[PDB]
Amino acid sequence: GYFKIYSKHTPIDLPQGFSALEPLVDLPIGINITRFQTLLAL
């Protein structure tokens, strides 16, 4: 039921390198999630 979101912003195909993702927000949603989709700015 916890929604954990990790994030990492780095100034620069995927680049070859190593970068850990620090935790960003813990969302106590307590729901069921099975599918997702993204949103674009036109």
């Binding site: 039921g1 916890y2 106590p28 949603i29 307590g30």
Partner: protein, 49 residues
């Protein structure tokens, strides 16, 4: 006839009895679900040594 408006009006006055004066009643109901509990009481802290 045989048909009356179901909601009647309180008539409160500053010259009424203890049982007839308006009383503000708030009922606090608590529920526990599979969702994470988040309504916590104040958490007391002691000074550091």
């Amino acid at each position: 006839f045989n048909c009356y408006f179901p909601l009647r009006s309180y008539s409160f006055r500053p010259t009424y009895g203890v049982g007839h004066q308006p009383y503000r009643v708030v009922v606090l109901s608590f529920e526990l679900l599979h969702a994470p509990a988040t309504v916590c009481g104040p958490k007391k802290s002691t000074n550091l040594v």
